């Protein structure tokens, strides 16, 4: 199905933003280890600490996560993400 997640460089949806509708083995490339807030628009997404879907991961469905820390995810750590 259609899935969409928006990731942001700074807390409270500030800074550079990327609007993804497909899997991101490099979290784009720009926001690797810079993701600080997230809006999941549709679908369940898995977020990984290392590129190419490696290491610890955390799953999120639709929601506005104004800080990843609040969602139990380490700040500036997400390095890839994909739909699950
Ligand atoms: Mg950041
Ligand atoms: Mg990382
Ligand atoms: Ni900035």
UniProtKB/TrEMBL annotation:
UniProt keyword list: Calcium, Metal-binding, Repeat
Residues the entry annotates as binding Mg(2+) 2: 33, 49, 77, 79
TM stretches of this protein: none
Binding site for Ca(2+) 1: 9, 34, 36, 76
UniProt-annotated binding residues for Mg(2+) 1: 9, 34, 36, 76
Domain Beta/gamma crystallin 'Greek key': from-to ranges: 3-42, 43-84
Signal peptide residue numbers: none
MF-aspect GO terms: metal ion binding
Binding site for Ca(2+) 2: 33, 49, 77, 79
Similarity annotation: Belongs to the beta/gamma-crystallin family.
Name of the protein: Beta/gama crystallin family protein
Residues of the full protein shown: 37 to 120 of 120
